[PDB]
Coordinates of C-alpha atoms and ligand atoms in Angstrom, one line a residue:
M1 CA 59.9 137.8 123.6
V2 CA 64.0 138.1 123.4
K3 CA 65.8 141.3 122.5
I4 CA 68.4 142.3 119.7
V5 CA 71.5 144.4 121.3
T6 CA 74.6 145.1 119.7
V7 CA 77.4 145.4 121.9
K8 CA 81.1 147.3 120.7
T9 CA 83.8 145.0 121.0
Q10 CA 87.3 145.0 120.4
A11 CA 88.8 143.2 116.9
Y12 CA 91.7 140.6 117.3
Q13 CA 94.3 139.5 115.3
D14 CA 94.8 136.2 115.6
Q15 CA 91.3 135.0 114.1
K16 CA 92.6 133.2 110.4
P17 CA 89.8 129.7 110.1
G18 CA 92.5 128.2 108.1
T19 CA 91.4 125.1 106.1
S20 CA 90.1 123.2 108.9
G21 CA 89.2 126.0 111.4
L22 CA 89.7 128.4 113.8
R23 CA 91.8 125.9 116.9
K24 CA 92.6 128.1 119.3
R25 CA 93.4 126.8 123.6
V26 CA 90.4 126.6 125.6
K27 CA 91.3 129.1 128.0
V28 CA 91.8 131.3 124.7
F29 CA 88.3 131.5 123.8
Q30 CA 87.1 131.7 128.0
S31 CA 89.8 134.2 129.1
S32 CA 89.4 136.6 126.3
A33 CA 86.8 138.6 126.5
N34 CA 84.2 138.1 123.1
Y35 CA 86.8 135.6 121.6
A36 CA 84.5 133.4 119.5
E37 CA 81.6 136.3 120.1
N38 CA 83.4 137.9 117.0
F39 CA 84.2 134.9 115.1
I40 CA 81.0 133.9 114.9
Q41 CA 80.0 137.0 114.2
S42 CA 82.2 137.3 111.0
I43 CA 81.5 133.9 110.1
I44 CA 77.4 134.8 109.3
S45 CA 78.6 138.4 108.5
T46 CA 79.6 136.7 105.6
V47 CA 76.1 135.3 104.8
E48 CA 74.5 137.9 102.1
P49 CA 71.5 139.7 104.6
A50 CA 68.9 139.6 101.6
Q51 CA 69.5 135.3 102.4
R52 CA 69.4 135.3 106.1
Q53 CA 66.1 134.7 106.8
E54 CA 65.5 131.5 104.7
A55 CA 68.6 130.4 105.5
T56 CA 69.6 127.1 107.0
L57 CA 72.4 126.5 109.4
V58 CA 74.0 123.3 110.9
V59 CA 74.9 123.3 114.2
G60 CA 76.9 121.0 116.1
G61 CA 80.5 119.7 117.5
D62 CA 82.3 116.5 119.4
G63 CA 80.9 117.2 122.9
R64 CA 84.5 118.5 124.0
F65 CA 84.8 121.2 126.8
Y66 CA 83.3 124.7 125.4
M67 CA 81.1 122.9 122.5
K68 CA 77.7 124.3 124.4
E69 CA 78.0 127.4 125.7
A70 CA 79.8 128.3 122.0
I71 CA 76.7 127.0 120.7
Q72 CA 74.5 129.1 122.9
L73 CA 76.0 131.5 121.0
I74 CA 75.9 130.8 118.0
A75 CA 72.7 131.2 118.3
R76 CA 72.0 134.3 120.0
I77 CA 73.8 135.9 117.1
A78 CA 73.1 134.0 113.9
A79 CA 69.4 135.0 115.5
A80 CA 69.9 138.6 115.3
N81 CA 71.4 138.3 112.0
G82 CA 68.4 137.9 110.8
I83 CA 69.6 134.2 109.9
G84 CA 65.7 132.4 109.5
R85 CA 67.1 128.8 111.4
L86 CA 69.6 126.9 112.9
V87 CA 69.2 122.7 113.1
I88 CA 71.4 121.8 116.2
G89 CA 71.7 118.0 116.9
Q90 CA 70.6 116.3 120.3
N91 CA 73.4 118.0 123.2
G92 CA 74.5 119.7 120.4
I93 CA 76.7 116.6 119.6
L94 CA 77.3 116.5 115.7
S95 CA 79.9 114.2 114.1
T96 CA 81.9 116.2 111.5
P97 CA 80.4 113.7 108.4
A98 CA 77.3 114.1 110.2
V99 CA 76.8 117.6 109.2
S100 CA 78.2 117.4 106.3
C101 CA 75.3 114.8 105.2
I102 CA 72.1 116.9 106.6
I103 CA 73.5 120.5 105.0
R104 CA 73.3 118.6 101.8
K105 CA 70.1 117.0 102.4
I106 CA 68.4 119.4 104.0
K107 CA 69.9 122.2 101.4
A108 CA 71.4 124.6 104.3
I109 CA 73.4 127.5 103.1
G110 CA 76.2 125.8 105.6
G111 CA 77.4 125.0 109.1
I112 CA 79.1 125.6 111.9
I113 CA 80.9 122.7 113.4
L114 CA 82.8 122.8 117.0
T115 CA 85.4 121.2 116.8
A116 CA 89.5 119.9 117.0
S117 CA 89.4 118.1 115.4
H118 CA 91.6 114.9 116.5
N119 CA 92.7 117.7 118.9
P120 CA 92.9 117.0 123.0
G121 CA 89.6 118.6 124.5
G122 CA 89.0 119.7 128.1
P123 CA 89.6 123.3 130.0
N124 CA 93.1 122.9 129.5
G125 CA 92.5 121.3 126.3
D126 CA 91.9 123.0 122.2
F127 CA 88.8 124.8 120.8
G128 CA 87.8 124.8 116.6
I129 CA 85.6 126.9 115.2
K130 CA 84.9 125.2 111.4
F131 CA 82.8 127.3 109.0
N132 CA 80.7 124.6 105.9
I133 CA 79.5 125.8 103.1
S134 CA 76.3 125.0 100.7
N135 CA 77.8 121.5 99.4
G136 CA 78.6 120.4 102.6
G137 CA 82.4 120.5 102.4
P138 CA 85.1 123.0 104.0
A139 CA 85.3 126.6 103.4
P140 CA 87.0 127.9 100.3
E141 CA 90.0 130.1 101.0
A142 CA 87.6 132.4 99.2
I143 CA 85.6 132.5 102.4
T144 CA 88.6 132.4 104.5
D145 CA 90.1 135.1 104.0
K146 CA 86.8 137.0 103.6
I147 CA 85.8 135.9 107.5
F148 CA 89.5 136.8 109.3
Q149 CA 89.6 139.9 107.0
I150 CA 86.1 140.7 108.9
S151 CA 87.5 139.3 112.3
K152 CA 90.6 142.1 112.1
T153 CA 88.3 144.9 111.7
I154 CA 84.7 143.4 113.5
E155 CA 83.5 146.1 115.8
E156 CA 80.3 145.3 117.0
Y157 CA 78.6 142.0 116.8
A158 CA 74.7 141.9 117.5
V159 CA 73.6 139.5 119.9
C160 CA 70.0 138.1 121.6
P161 CA 71.9 138.3 125.1
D162 CA 68.4 136.8 126.1
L163 CA 68.2 133.6 124.2
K164 CA 68.6 130.3 125.4
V165 CA 68.3 127.2 123.1
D166 CA 67.4 124.2 125.0
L167 CA 69.5 121.2 123.4
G168 CA 68.9 118.6 125.1
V169 CA 65.0 118.1 124.1
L170 CA 64.1 116.7 120.3
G171 CA 62.2 119.9 118.4
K172 CA 61.5 122.7 117.4
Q173 CA 61.8 126.0 119.1
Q174 CA 61.0 129.5 118.3
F175 CA 61.6 132.3 118.9
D176 CA 60.0 135.5 118.9
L177 CA 62.9 138.3 118.3
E178 CA 61.9 142.1 119.4
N179 CA 61.2 144.4 116.0
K180 CA 61.5 140.9 113.5
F181 CA 58.6 140.0 112.2
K182 CA 59.7 136.5 111.7
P183 CA 61.1 134.0 114.4
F184 CA 64.0 132.1 114.7
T185 CA 63.7 128.9 114.3
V186 CA 66.4 126.1 116.1
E187 CA 65.2 122.5 115.2
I188 CA 66.8 120.1 117.9
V189 CA 66.9 117.2 115.9
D190 CA 68.6 113.3 116.6
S191 CA 72.0 112.8 116.4
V192 CA 72.2 109.6 114.7
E193 CA 69.4 109.5 112.3
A194 CA 69.8 111.4 109.1
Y195 CA 73.4 110.3 108.9
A196 CA 72.8 106.9 110.0
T197 CA 69.7 107.0 107.1
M198 CA 72.1 107.6 105.0
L199 CA 74.5 105.0 105.8
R200 CA 71.2 103.0 105.5
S201 CA 70.5 104.0 101.6
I202 CA 75.3 102.9 101.2
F203 CA 75.2 99.8 102.7
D204 CA 73.5 96.6 102.9
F205 CA 72.2 96.6 106.3
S206 CA 71.0 93.7 105.8
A207 CA 74.1 91.9 104.8
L208 CA 76.2 93.7 107.7
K209 CA 73.2 92.8 110.2
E210 CA 73.4 89.2 109.1
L211 CA 77.8 89.5 109.0
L212 CA 77.5 90.6 112.4
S213 CA 75.2 89.0 114.9
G214 CA 74.3 85.0 115.0
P215 CA 76.8 83.0 117.4
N216 CA 78.8 82.5 113.8
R217 CA 79.4 86.3 114.0
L218 CA 82.4 88.5 112.9
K219 CA 83.5 89.9 116.4
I220 CA 84.1 93.4 116.0
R221 CA 86.0 96.4 118.6
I222 CA 85.6 100.2 117.7
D223 CA 87.2 102.7 119.4
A224 CA 85.4 106.0 119.4
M225 CA 88.3 107.2 121.6
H226 CA 85.6 109.9 123.9
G227 CA 84.9 111.4 120.7
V228 CA 82.1 112.4 119.2
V229 CA 81.5 108.5 117.1
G230 CA 80.3 107.1 120.2
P231 CA 76.2 106.9 119.5
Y232 CA 77.1 106.3 115.5
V233 CA 78.9 103.2 117.0
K234 CA 75.8 102.3 119.0
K235 CA 72.9 102.8 117.4
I236 CA 74.4 102.0 114.0
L237 CA 76.6 99.5 115.1
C238 CA 75.4 97.1 117.8
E239 CA 71.5 98.5 118.5
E240 CA 70.4 98.7 114.4
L241 CA 73.3 96.1 112.9
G242 CA 73.3 93.8 116.2
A243 CA 76.0 93.8 116.7
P244 CA 77.0 92.9 120.7
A245 CA 77.2 95.9 123.2
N246 CA 80.8 94.9 124.7
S247 CA 81.8 95.8 120.9
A248 CA 81.4 99.5 121.3
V249 CA 84.7 100.4 122.5
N250 CA 84.8 104.1 124.6
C251 CA 81.5 105.1 122.4
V252 CA 80.5 107.9 125.5
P253 CA 81.6 111.1 124.2
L254 CA 83.4 112.6 127.3
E255 CA 84.4 116.8 126.9
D256 CA 87.8 116.5 128.2
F257 CA 87.8 112.7 125.5
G258 CA 88.6 110.3 128.8
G259 CA 91.9 112.8 129.1
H260 CA 93.2 111.6 125.4
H261 CA 94.4 112.6 122.6
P262 CA 91.5 111.7 119.9
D263 CA 93.3 110.7 117.7
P264 CA 93.1 107.2 116.0
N265 CA 96.8 105.6 115.4
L266 CA 99.3 102.8 117.3
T267 CA 100.3 104.9 119.7
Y268 CA 97.2 107.0 120.6
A269 CA 94.6 103.4 120.3
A270 CA 97.2 101.0 121.6
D271 CA 93.8 100.1 124.1
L272 CA 92.1 99.3 121.5
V273 CA 95.2 97.6 119.8
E274 CA 95.2 95.5 123.3
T275 CA 92.1 93.8 123.5
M276 CA 93.2 92.9 118.8
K277 CA 96.0 91.5 120.7
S278 CA 94.5 89.2 123.1
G279 CA 92.6 86.9 119.5
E280 CA 89.5 86.8 120.2
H281 CA 88.6 89.7 117.6
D282 CA 88.5 89.9 114.2
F283 CA 88.5 93.8 113.4
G284 CA 88.6 96.9 114.9
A285 CA 88.3 101.0 114.5
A286 CA 89.4 103.8 116.0
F287 CA 88.2 107.5 115.6
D288 CA 89.4 111.3 115.5
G289 CA 87.1 113.0 118.0
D290 CA 85.3 114.9 114.9
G291 CA 85.1 110.8 113.0
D292 CA 86.3 112.4 109.7
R293 CA 89.7 110.0 110.5
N294 CA 90.0 106.0 110.9
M295 CA 92.6 103.5 111.8
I296 CA 91.6 99.9 110.8
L297 CA 93.1 96.7 112.6
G298 CA 93.0 93.3 111.5
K299 CA 92.9 90.4 114.0
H300 CA 96.0 90.0 116.8
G301 CA 96.0 93.6 115.8
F302 CA 97.3 93.4 111.8
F303 CA 97.9 97.2 111.2
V304 CA 96.2 98.2 108.0
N305 CA 98.2 101.4 107.0
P306 CA 95.9 103.7 105.4
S307 CA 97.1 103.3 101.6
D308 CA 96.7 99.6 101.7
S309 CA 93.1 100.9 102.9
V310 CA 91.7 103.2 100.7
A311 CA 93.8 100.3 98.2
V312 CA 91.6 97.7 99.7
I313 CA 88.9 99.1 99.9
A314 CA 89.7 100.3 96.1
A315 CA 90.1 96.5 94.9
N316 CA 86.7 95.2 96.2
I317 CA 84.1 98.9 96.3
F318 CA 81.9 96.2 94.1
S319 CA 81.1 95.4 98.0
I320 CA 79.7 97.9 98.5
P321 CA 76.4 98.6 96.9
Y322 CA 76.3 102.4 96.8
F323 CA 79.4 102.0 94.4
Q324 CA 77.3 99.7 92.3
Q325 CA 74.5 101.7 91.5
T326 CA 77.0 104.8 90.8
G327 CA 80.4 103.5 88.7
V328 CA 83.0 104.9 89.9
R329 CA 83.9 108.4 88.6
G330 CA 87.7 108.2 89.7
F331 CA 90.2 107.9 92.7
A332 CA 92.5 110.2 94.9
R333 CA 95.0 110.7 96.7
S334 CA 97.1 113.0 98.8
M335 CA 100.6 113.3 97.3
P336 CA 102.9 111.6 99.9
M337 CA 100.3 108.5 100.7
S338 CA 101.8 105.2 99.2
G339 CA 100.9 104.1 95.5
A340 CA 99.1 101.1 96.6
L341 CA 95.8 103.4 95.3
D342 CA 97.5 103.2 91.8
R343 CA 98.3 100.4 91.2
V344 CA 94.6 99.1 91.9
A345 CA 93.8 102.2 89.3
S346 CA 95.9 101.5 87.0
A347 CA 94.5 97.9 86.5
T348 CA 91.0 99.5 86.0
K349 CA 91.3 101.4 83.6
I350 CA 89.3 104.2 86.4
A351 CA 91.7 107.3 86.9
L352 CA 93.7 108.0 89.7
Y353 CA 94.1 111.6 90.7
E354 CA 97.8 113.1 93.2
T355 CA 96.8 115.9 94.5
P356 CA 98.7 118.0 97.4
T357 CA 97.7 117.4 100.8
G358 CA 94.6 118.9 102.3
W359 CA 90.7 118.6 101.2
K360 CA 89.6 121.7 98.6
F361 CA 91.6 119.3 95.8
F362 CA 89.4 116.6 96.5
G363 CA 85.7 118.3 97.1
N364 CA 85.9 120.0 93.5
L365 CA 87.0 116.8 91.3
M366 CA 84.0 114.8 93.4
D367 CA 81.9 117.8 92.2
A368 CA 82.8 117.4 89.0
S369 CA 81.7 114.3 89.1
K370 CA 85.3 112.4 88.8
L371 CA 86.1 111.1 91.9
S372 CA 84.4 108.5 93.8
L373 CA 87.1 107.2 96.9
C374 CA 89.3 108.9 98.3
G375 CA 92.4 108.9 101.1
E376 CA 95.7 111.1 103.1
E377 CA 98.0 109.9 104.5
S378 CA 96.2 110.9 108.0
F379 CA 93.8 108.0 108.3
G380 CA 91.2 109.8 106.1
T381 CA 88.8 107.5 103.7
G382 CA 85.9 109.1 102.4
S383 CA 83.9 109.6 98.9
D384 CA 81.9 112.0 97.2
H385 CA 78.7 110.8 99.7
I386 CA 79.2 113.5 101.5
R387 CA 82.0 116.3 101.2
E388 CA 84.2 115.2 103.8
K389 CA 85.9 111.9 105.3
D390 CA 83.7 109.8 106.9
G391 CA 85.5 107.3 109.4
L392 CA 82.5 105.5 110.3
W393 CA 82.0 105.1 107.3
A394 CA 84.8 103.7 105.8
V395 CA 84.4 100.9 108.8
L396 CA 81.5 100.2 107.3
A397 CA 82.7 100.7 104.0
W398 CA 85.8 97.8 105.3
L399 CA 82.8 95.2 106.9
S400 CA 80.4 95.2 103.8
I401 CA 84.6 94.3 101.8
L402 CA 85.1 91.8 104.9
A403 CA 81.3 90.2 104.4
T404 CA 81.3 89.5 101.2
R405 CA 85.5 88.1 100.9
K406 CA 84.7 85.5 103.6
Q407 CA 88.5 86.5 104.9
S408 CA 90.1 87.8 107.4
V409 CA 92.2 91.4 107.7
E410 CA 94.8 90.2 107.4
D411 CA 94.4 87.1 104.7
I412 CA 92.9 90.3 102.6
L413 CA 95.8 91.8 102.4
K414 CA 98.9 89.4 101.9
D415 CA 95.9 88.3 98.4
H416 CA 96.0 92.8 97.9
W417 CA 99.7 92.5 97.7
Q418 CA 100.0 88.8 96.5
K419 CA 98.0 90.2 93.3
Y420 CA 98.6 94.4 93.0
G421 CA 102.0 93.9 94.7
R422 CA 103.3 96.0 98.3
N423 CA 103.4 98.9 99.1
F424 CA 106.2 99.5 102.1
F425 CA 105.9 102.9 103.7
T426 CA 106.5 104.6 106.0
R427 CA 105.7 108.8 107.7
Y428 CA 109.1 109.8 109.7
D429 CA 107.9 112.4 111.7
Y430 CA 111.1 115.4 113.4
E431 CA 108.8 117.5 115.0
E432 CA 109.3 121.2 116.4
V433 CA 113.1 121.4 114.4
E434 CA 114.9 124.6 114.4
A435 CA 113.5 126.0 111.7
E436 CA 116.4 127.6 109.8
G437 CA 118.0 124.3 109.4
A438 CA 115.0 122.5 108.2
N439 CA 114.4 125.2 106.1
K440 CA 118.5 124.9 104.7
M441 CA 118.3 121.3 104.3
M442 CA 114.9 121.6 101.9
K443 CA 116.9 124.2 99.7
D444 CA 120.1 122.2 99.1
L445 CA 118.5 119.2 98.4
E446 CA 115.7 121.2 96.4
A447 CA 119.0 123.0 94.6
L448 CA 120.6 119.1 94.4
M449 CA 117.8 117.9 92.8
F450 CA 117.4 120.4 90.1
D451 CA 120.8 119.7 88.9
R452 CA 121.2 119.0 85.6
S453 CA 122.7 114.9 86.1
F454 CA 120.6 114.2 89.2
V455 CA 118.1 111.6 87.1
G456 CA 119.6 108.5 86.4
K457 CA 122.0 108.7 89.2
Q458 CA 121.8 104.9 91.0
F459 CA 122.0 104.8 95.2
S460 CA 122.9 101.5 96.5
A461 CA 122.2 99.9 100.0
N462 CA 122.5 96.0 100.6
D463 CA 123.2 95.3 96.9
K464 CA 119.2 97.1 96.2
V465 CA 119.9 99.8 93.3
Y466 CA 117.7 102.5 93.2
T467 CA 117.5 105.1 89.6
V468 CA 116.0 108.2 90.4
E469 CA 113.8 109.1 87.9
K470 CA 112.0 112.5 89.3
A471 CA 112.6 114.6 90.6
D472 CA 110.5 117.7 91.4
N473 CA 108.8 120.4 93.7
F474 CA 105.6 118.7 93.8
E475 CA 102.8 121.5 91.5
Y476 CA 99.3 120.8 91.5
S477 CA 96.8 122.3 88.7
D478 CA 93.5 121.9 90.1
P479 CA 91.2 121.1 86.7
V480 CA 88.1 122.5 88.2
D481 CA 89.1 126.0 89.9
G482 CA 92.7 126.8 88.2
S483 CA 94.0 126.8 91.3
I484 CA 97.4 126.3 91.6
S485 CA 99.6 125.2 94.3
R486 CA 103.2 125.7 94.5
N487 CA 105.6 123.7 96.6
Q488 CA 103.6 121.2 97.6
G489 CA 107.2 118.4 99.0
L490 CA 109.9 117.7 97.4
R491 CA 109.9 114.4 95.1
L492 CA 113.0 111.6 94.9
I493 CA 110.7 108.9 91.9
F494 CA 112.9 105.9 91.5
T495 CA 112.6 103.8 88.2
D496 CA 111.1 100.8 90.1
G497 CA 108.1 102.3 91.5
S498 CA 110.2 103.2 94.6
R499 CA 109.7 107.5 96.3
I500 CA 110.9 109.0 98.9
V501 CA 109.3 112.5 99.7
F502 CA 109.9 115.1 101.9
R503 CA 107.8 118.0 103.8
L504 CA 107.4 121.5 106.1
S505 CA 104.2 121.3 107.9
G506 CA 109.7 125.6 115.3
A507 CA 108.8 123.9 112.4
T508 CA 108.3 120.1 111.1
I509 CA 110.2 117.9 108.7
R510 CA 108.1 114.8 107.7
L511 CA 109.5 112.4 105.7
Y512 CA 107.3 109.9 103.1
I513 CA 109.6 106.4 102.4
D514 CA 107.0 104.7 100.0
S515 CA 108.8 100.9 98.4
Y516 CA 107.6 98.6 96.0
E517 CA 107.9 95.4 96.3
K518 CA 106.0 92.1 93.6
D519 CA 108.5 89.5 95.2
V520 CA 106.5 87.6 97.6
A521 CA 109.1 86.3 98.8
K522 CA 109.8 90.4 100.5
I523 CA 106.2 90.7 100.2
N524 CA 105.8 89.6 103.8
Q525 CA 108.4 91.4 106.0
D526 CA 108.6 93.9 108.2
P527 CA 107.9 97.2 106.9
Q528 CA 110.6 98.9 109.1
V529 CA 113.4 96.2 107.5
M530 CA 112.1 96.2 104.3
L531 CA 112.4 100.2 104.0
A532 CA 116.0 100.8 105.6
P533 CA 118.1 101.1 101.8
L534 CA 116.0 104.2 101.2
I535 CA 115.6 105.5 104.5
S536 CA 119.5 105.6 104.5
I537 CA 119.4 106.9 101.4
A538 CA 117.0 109.7 101.9
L539 CA 119.2 110.6 105.3
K540 CA 122.0 111.0 103.2
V541 CA 121.2 113.5 100.0
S542 CA 119.2 114.8 102.5
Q543 CA 121.8 115.8 104.8
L544 CA 118.7 115.9 107.4
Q545 CA 121.0 114.7 111.0
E546 CA 123.2 117.1 110.3
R547 CA 120.8 119.9 108.8
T548 CA 118.9 119.3 112.5
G549 CA 120.8 117.5 115.0
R550 CA 117.6 114.5 114.6
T551 CA 119.6 111.1 115.0
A552 CA 115.7 110.1 115.2
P553 CA 112.3 111.3 114.4
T554 CA 110.4 111.7 117.2
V555 CA 107.1 109.8 115.8
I556 CA 107.1 106.5 113.1
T557 CA 103.8 106.0 111.7
Ligands
CO1 CO1 89.0 115.1 112.5

């Protein structure tokens, strides 16, 4: 017996969702009266009133501080707006790939994912609100624009103030709204179940069970960085697949993520790296707060970069029963990643699409049945099993490949480079640079390489000589939606398969170096040593130090 009250409010101005959802500080969602109410209402207002009663929205998030408060808001507005039902994970917890799974499983209209991914969580941390649609992936620009347009003019939302959802107990809760014939329905479902069931069908859990158990076992440690993938690890890898309990590391989600950044890489996951370095374990992995990113580590802490990782998966992709059954429709990677994937795809006569950074391009090719496996340069791996990237899925793919190959992680890479050659890769980040100078740097570079005779001009370092093949500002004409994306980054492509790429994101400069070696003598060297000639070349032609004052990147990957 709950009522419906419409509350007049003041429209905020900065509620743009972007491709990753509205991300603001927690204290902004709190100190700003009705910040969340307004944006949720704007989301729900994009859904046709003639379809709300029969519609379901999937709701959950990464466990960060303010999540359940926001979930309760979402149900009070969903219900008051005539949305027929919410499907919510127990305690409000659903990883980002879980949300995609459920939306597609139950043909929901979409979902609201309460997460800021890798951004820090806590009272003094971040909060994000993501909106997904009926194919299970991120809402596109056309819906993103409508939302923010509605948000900037918002004059009132509709709420059920007295509505309270019990997120801890499984099953169906129902709410008889004042003056509505149809009840409002909330199913609380187990956070892991539908996602585990999908993974159970994609991989050979029997084969994995054998890998991970017995005194013959693959010793593994999986770092969920105190985020959402915790229970997924414990229920799937430990309980179901019999990995020992110690395998699960930081697999209790905390509202502050333990105080650290839920961001998988060699600095932020240096705990997990310490462990692997002790030489006891064969395989290690870490995830971000919402479960769509992943970092892979070998014994002794051998680091497998994202671009090589999708390449290794691609080259052993038929270790995975899903791909045995569906075939591989194609390979994709964002433009700034290394070309290791390309080499695998060139040897199989399966297509490679090089897209700009961002999910919409992958999702388009996936929905057109042309894309099976993909990566993003920021520790993203995915497949068309869902319409988000999926870190734990990537871990299970590696474990599958380990089980069939029966080699160490490092030995697998060494063989992969012996066969396809090595794409030494690194990414230099220059953070908080004077946006004025950086833009001058980019424009002066773009004009330099748009000169007539800029192609052909050689460059030398340690007698090593690079000749420029192509140079442009990358553009991509999307084969599905007709979109055209321009200014996606400056590319210096060399006749030996090496590349230098600059992007902007004050400002931040991202410098990607991809140097390719076929020689086995050069295959197993320090990347920073092998990349130094092209790094010097990049800094010279861009004159980055001169345009920014930076003698050094802020961060190296
Ligand atoms: Co994420």
